């Protein structure tokens, strides 16, 4: 009953191990989690989206900066740019997430 | 009106100032409102602007075919696209959604 839960900004993702940790602009909104190259290139340049619906959002231990999101298909794996952020975002996820079912 | 809400989000162009002219900002489109988002370090963000829509007056400009102007009474954004196919996408998202938040 109260205002829905958005969130954008810049992450650092894995992408694989010849091109490691990349920033990422990552956007919170219409029950998923999507990322682009960049602010600038979200008309065409959607890179990947994961649908929240049955995604599990696990902070790292040792990495205090990480998170993970998985669904069956994908895992993710994000960095903040510090400990409160990136507790903002699993927050800001969990909640719309929850919204949305 | 049945269907889902018109929302976007995407950047525009915005004017600040004469010193640092037009600056690119995350703009959304939601809940009857339209907003900005800034940073100061290109990685965290926050809202830094709200117009209520249902008495907003949009105001496209006859010369800078890229240009909107958004205003309420009490303030004004001057907002360019990128090019006026893109301006018209935006100045119809937010009249359609003004009119399906109404009453
Ligand atoms: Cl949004
Ligand atoms: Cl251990
Ligand atoms: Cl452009």
Redesign the interface.
Known sequence: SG??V?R???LSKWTNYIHGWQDRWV?L?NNALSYYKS??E??YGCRGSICLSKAVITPHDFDECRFDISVNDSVWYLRA?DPD?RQQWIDAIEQHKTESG
Do not use: A
């Open positions: 205002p829905p958005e954008c900004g810049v956007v909104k602010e600038d979200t008309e740019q952020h």
